[PDB]
């Protein structure tokens, strides 16, 4: 009964336009990249900026 509702809620996915399908397809790919990370070298350079603008 639920499997027939999730397929009825997402039944409008066959009426999407090409640009509507392209946007969604890109969204899936992007969400796999994740968030970049700050390496120790980059963190060490940011700490210098903080200490220089707070203590001297």
């Amino acid at each position: 009964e639920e499997q027939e509702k999730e397929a009825k809620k997402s039944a409008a996915k066959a009426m999407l336009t090409p640009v509507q399908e392209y946007n969604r397809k890109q969204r899936e790919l992007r969400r796999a990249r994740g968030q970049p990370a700050l390496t120790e070298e980059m963190l060490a350079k940011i700490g210098e900026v903080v200490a220089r603008n707070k203590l001297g």
Binding site: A11, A12, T17, P18, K25
Partner: protein, 179 residues
């Protein structure tokens, strides 16, 4: 309404209610229904007359009638300029009869035709279509023209080529009926 007969397609133009009754000639398997995807914004809770035509965003609005001297208020109504025209659809190739307002008739000429007015993907247009406009949108998607036009726009957007169409299922019921 009383819609014409699509030249090369068994599927008829959907009924105002959403039903798609097939003729008796076309053999149909036991308990087979043609369901249209639900309208994203659902029906219109007031002015149900607009759920059966192309009214855009025009509803029946209420206001006051102001007297010339003392300016006494009396409640009245403003109705949209609703007409009934036969709009041509290049995809179907017939004259789709429907009740459309005069402001939507200017939007059909601006975009280049009924098919171009129904295929808009902007949020403001899908709200202007309405339940009846969402049924015509689904119908033209079954035609080979729009199917061959959308398949060509996926090659320009770098999308993989895109199972059985609805017109093929009905075609497979005419051959199975003779076996």
């Amino acid at each position: 309404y009383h819609q014409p007969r699509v030249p090369s397609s068994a599927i008829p133009i959907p009924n105002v209610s959403g039903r798609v009754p097939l003729p008796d000639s076309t053999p149909v398997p036991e308990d087979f229904k043609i369901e249209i995807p639900s309208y994203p914004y659902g029906p219109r809770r007031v002015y149900h007359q607009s759920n059966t035509g192309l009214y855009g965003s025009a509803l029946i609005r209420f206001g006051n009638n102001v007297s010339k001297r003392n300016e006494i208020k009396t409640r009245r109504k403003w109705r949209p300029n609703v007409q009934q025209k036969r709009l041509w659809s290049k995809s179907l190739g017939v004259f789709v009869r429907t009740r459309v307002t005069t402001r939507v008739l200017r939007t059909i000429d601006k975009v280049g035709g009924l098919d171009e007015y129904l295929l808009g993907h902007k949020a403001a247009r899908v709200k202007e279509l309405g339940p009846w406009g969402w049924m015509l949108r689904w119908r033209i998607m079954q035609t080979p023209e729009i199917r061959e036009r959308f398949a060509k726009e996926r090659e320009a957007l770098g999308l993989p080529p895109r199972e059985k169409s609805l017109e093929e299922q009905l075609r497979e019921f005419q051959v199975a009926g003779i076996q």
